[PDB]
Every structure is written in structure tokens, then in C-alpha cells.
């Protein structure tokens, strides 16, 4: 396909996903809401192959991963569980949310700490 879409006007297309990067830092919930206000969600990571561009991302950024201490594992805002062997989760700060960092790492951060965030629209 010479053509990539469909995507919001000034967004990044890579393999029929859309991505935007927001400089203006916000806590985990404020970020979720900013994503929701563009029929979008926080970055979900489902494939090393379809999202290999993510290896080239500088610094760290909120993604839709959230701890569920009842069973003791991670899930996305939409509800699906963490495909094992996708992310390595590193304990950094004490919290129940995770910053994505290159390459396919999640750092655990306190949900209240303002950070940059990445929104994604999927297929």
C-alpha cells in the first residue's frame, strides 16, 4: 500500500495505526482524558513488528498500562491483558501506572506525577 490511514489530520501513520506526542505534561488520568477527547486512547503495545518505530522514541511517556493488585499483573485501559514477552516492566517509582521507554520497556511511575504522553488510534 502506497497509502496509510485512516488518521486524524496532523497525526503520525505507521502500518494503519495513528500516534501523536503531547509535550504539555499531565498525570495519568489527565492524559487518559486528553486521549479520550480525540476518540483516541493512551499507547497500547500489541506487536514488536507492527510498532517497531517505538524503538526510536526518545525519553519516557505515559501509556495505557495500569496495575491490578487483586491478581497482581498489568492490563490496558480498554481491558485486554499484557501479552507476555512484549514489554520488560522495571520497578522505578512506587505506583500503579507505567511510562513507556525504548525499546519495549515499561517503567512503573506514580500515577499523579506529570509526564508527556503518547495517544494511539488502532485498527
Amino acid at each position: 500500500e502506497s497509502y496509510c490511514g485512516p488518521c486524524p489530520k496532523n497525526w503520525i501513520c505507521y502500518k494503519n495505526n495513528c500516534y501523536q506526542f503531547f509535550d504539555e505534561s499531565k498525570n495519568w488520568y489527565e492524559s487518559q482524558a486528553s486521549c479520550m477527547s480525540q476518540n483516541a486512547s493512551l499507547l497500547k503495545v500489541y506487536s514488536k513488528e507492527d510498532q517497531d518505530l517505538l524503538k526510536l522514541v526518545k525519553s519516557y511517556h505515559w501509556m495505557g498500562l495500569v496495575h491490578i493488585p487483586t491478581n497482581g499483573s498489568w492490563q490496558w485501559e480498554d481491558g485486554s491483558i499484557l501479552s507476555p514477552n512484549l514489554l520488560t516492566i522495571i520497578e522505578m517509582q512506587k505506583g500503579d501506572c507505567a511510562l513507556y521507554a525504548s525499546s519495549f520497556k515499561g517503567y512503573i511511575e506514580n500515577c499523579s506525577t506529570p509526564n508527556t504522553y503518547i495517544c494511539m488510534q488502532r485498527t
Binding site: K58, I90, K94, S102, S103
Partner: protein, 262 residues
């Protein structure tokens, strides 16, 4: 002059195994405080360029701290210290240093451009965690470091060019005085004051012959506390030999001779 320097000194903290959101970078220029940067803003102890870069470096250091094993209960610190110099020959040095709970464990400079750790068992162990951390990151080439060196020096040059750094000598004021007039002898003290830079030579001389360091009494070099220093040297002479004693000072490539005033 002695060389123009620039230092970045970035600190991240862990409390009971948890990396604190905050960090602090303190920029110093030719030794003198210049910027302090928290997560939010840089302030002069507008600075976007510095806030953009120094915040980034901060985040990057929170992660590296996370990859350190056995983070013993309580507070520990990781610092990334960057110092570059431009000498009078226009030759340049640069160093990156990592300090854990204030002890060096890893060092890169521009002449070797190799990483080199102490012999300290804890050091080798900390360097291990961190270099194994840098191995994994497919995107941490030898270039990443050669660029940190180059960056430091480009900033230092930017700061020189725009006259943020002044390289002005202040030649000393000198006063000689008579004192401790007692048992037919007198003390003569020669005080140097207000001067920069620090290095200075200041001796008593009987008949142009400079006196042994053991026949005189020397003040320390104290900061005046307005950027400059002061010091002194005195010696004990017989009354009415005072016209054979002179204080000799070398400073900022002046040489000068001050006699005992009548």
C-alpha cells in the same frame, strides 16, 4: 588565564527502593554558580534551551538508577557530572563521571574516550549494572558519549561568545604597616587585598635579598566574599632597620616593591 570551564552536576534520589520524581542539575561556569534546574524550571543562581536539555538528561538518569541492583533501604543518590574546559592553547578537555552515594564508579573523557572504573569492589559491581544497562539499549553507540562531550564544549563556546563569562583580573591593593612595637624591635606586615585571580607571590626582602619562608609569618588566602581574595605576610625587624625592608609582590604579570612607610 587558567582555562574556561563549564560543569553540569545532575542528581537523582531513591528512597526505600523508589526513584523520586524530582532531580536537580546545578550548572557552574568558570567555577561560579550560574544555573539551578529542578524538573520544572531553570533559574539563575529565559532558559528554554537549558530546560529542554537538562530535563531530558534528568529523566535518562532516573531510568539508569532503576537498573541498579540491591538498592539498600533508605536514601541513595546517583549523579552524572559533566565538565569540559577550553584552555589558552584552544585545546579542550571533557569528562563524564557517575557518582553513586557520592563515590565515583565510572568515568569517560575525551583523550581515552574509553570508560574506566575504580578497583573498589562496589564500584566494579555498579559499573556492571550500568554498562549492562547501556549494552541492552540497541541505541547507545560510542557516538552517544562522543556527542555528550561535543555538546558540553558547544555550550561553553556559546556562553563565552555572548560574554556571560568575564575574564577580568583585579590587581591587588597593598598596604604596609608598623605593629607590635616592643623590646626595641617591630613587626612590619604587608597586606594584599581585593585581588583576583587567587595565585599570588608576596615576600619581604632585606636589601633586595628575599627572606627565608621560616623568618616570616604568612596569612592564609581568604575569600574577601565579593569574588576576590586577600592575604598578608609580616616579619620581625630591629627599629631603624625599616629602610632596608621592602615587600615584593608578583600578580597578574605586574612586579612591584612596597617599602615600610615612615
Amino acid at each position: 588565564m587558567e582555562p574556561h570551564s563549564l560543569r553540569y552536576n545532575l542528581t537523582v534520589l531513591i528512597w526505600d527502593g523508589s526513584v523520586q520524581s524530582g532531580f536537580l542539575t546545578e550548572v557552574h561556569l568558570d567555577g561560579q554558580p550560574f544555573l539551578r534546574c529542578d524538573r520544572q524550571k531553570c533559574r539563575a543562581k529565559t532558559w528554554d534551551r537549558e530546560t529542554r536539555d537538562l530535563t531530558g538528561n534528568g529523566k535518562d538518569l532516573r531510568m539508569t538508577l532503576a537498573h541498579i541492583k540491591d538498592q539498600k533501604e533508605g536514601l541513595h543518590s546517583l549523579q552524572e557530572i559533566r565538565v569540559c574546559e577550553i584552555h589558552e592553547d584552544n585545546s579542550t578537555r571533557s569528562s563524564i563521571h557517575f557518582y553513586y552515594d557520592g563515590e565515583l564508579f565510572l568515568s569517560n573523557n575525551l583523550e581515552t574516550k574509553e570508560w574506566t572504573m575504580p578497583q573498589s569492589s562496589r564500584a566494579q559491581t555498579l559499573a556492571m549494572n550500568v554498562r549492562n544497562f547501556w549494552k541492552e539499549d540497541a541505541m547507545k553507540t560510542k557516538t552517544h558519549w562522543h556527542a555528550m562531550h561535543a555538546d558540553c564544549l558547544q555550550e561553553l563556546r556559546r556562553y563565552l561568545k555572548s560574554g556571560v563569562v568575564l575574564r577580568r583580573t583585579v590587581p591587588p591593593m597593598v598596604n604596609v604597616t608598623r605593629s607590635e612595637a616592643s623590646e626595641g624591635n617591630i613587626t612590619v606586615t604587608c597586606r594584599a587585598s581585593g585581588f583576583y585571580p587567587w595565585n599570588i607571590t608576596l615576600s619581604w626582602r632585606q636589601d633586595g635579598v628575599s627572606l627565608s619562608h621560616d623568618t616570616q609569618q604568612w596569612g592564609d588566602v581568604l575569600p574577601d566574599g565579593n569574588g576576590t581574595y586577600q592575604t598578608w605576610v609580616a616579619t620581625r625587624i630591629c627599629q631603624g632597620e625599616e629602610q632596608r625592608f621592602t615587600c615584593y609582590m608578583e600578580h597578574s604579570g605586574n612586579h612591584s616593591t612596597h617599602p615600610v612607610p615612615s
